[PDB]
């Protein structure tokens, strides 16, 4: 019947799309797991505190950067000021 | 020639200008209409901000073209 053929058409469309999507998902995850045997998911923190490696925000100004210009090491959160004083040659 | 400017609210205003008119002059006209200083104005055309000292013709700006006006949102 018309009703039946229409149901079959819709089923055809849905099963085609589903099989495509699922095949793509399974192939991608298979690839990721095979390439990277020790694979870990990026961390999700419900508390909104930890990064994708499950770490908190690092202490600045505890970190420093070595400015290749002039040969001076400069605390990173003060780097721009240095460049304003350094690039002004 | 007449050109247009689409303001923050979406309202469009009209200016009478020449191709050789400077961005400063246009901004002055905008100041004269809206009461906003030129230093607060950002004038956009074709994906570029229009720069003082240049002319409309430098940017191939023609009659009844529309410029888009915005402000600045500073974040550091």
């Amino acid at each position: 019947t018309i009703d039946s053929i229409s149901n079959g058409i819709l089923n055809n469309l849905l099963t085609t799309l589903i099989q495509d999507i699922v095949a793509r998902e399974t192939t991608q995850q298979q690839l990721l797991k095979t390439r990277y045997p020790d694979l870990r998911s990026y961390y999700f923190d419900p508390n909104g505190s930890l990064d994708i490696n499950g770490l908190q925000k690092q202490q600045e100004s505890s970190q420093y950067i070595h400015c290749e210009n002039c040969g001076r090491d400069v605390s990173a959160n003060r780097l721009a000021a240095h460049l304003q004083r350094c690039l002004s040659r | 020639m007449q050109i247009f400017v689409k303001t923050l609210t979406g309202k469009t205003i009209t200016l009478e200008v020449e191709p050789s008119d400077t961005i400063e002059n246009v901004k002055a006209k905008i100041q004269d209409k809206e009461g906003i200083p030129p230093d607060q104005q950002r004038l956009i055309f074709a994906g570029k901000q229009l720069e003082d000292g240049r002319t409309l013709s430098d940017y191939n700006i023609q009659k009844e073209s529309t410029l888009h006006l915005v402000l600045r949102l500073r974040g550091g």
């Binding site: 100004s61 001076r72 090491d73 400069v74 605390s75 | -």
Partner: protein, 93 residues
């Protein structure tokens, strides 16, 4: 008893700017003086600004225009930027 001093924060900053570089006790002492002094100069002139503008409260706006009075152009400007920057940083976080 406790004699307070800015020797540690200043050291810190020295390390920020010259990590392989040390400061003598006396240099430090001097610095600490400069700090107390500028503290008074600022605080005082701010107090004056408050008083002068019939206002019961000192906000960083006061400290700003203060900076614009004490300091010459570029110094003032930079100091201002640095400040409202660290203010923003405190606000957001």
């Amino acid at each position: 008893t406790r004699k307070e001093s800015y020797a540690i924060y200043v050291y810190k900053v020295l390390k920020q700017v010259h990590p392989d570089t040390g400061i003598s006790s006396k240099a430090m002492s001097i610095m600490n003086s400069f700090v107390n002094d500028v503290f008074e100069r600022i605080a005082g002139e701010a107090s004056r600004l408050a008083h002068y503008n019939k206002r019961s409260t000192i906000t960083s706006r006061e400290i700003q225009t203060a900076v614009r009075l004490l300091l010459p152009g570029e110094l003032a400007k930079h100091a201002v930027s640095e400040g409202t920057k660290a203010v923003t940083k405190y606000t957001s976080a």
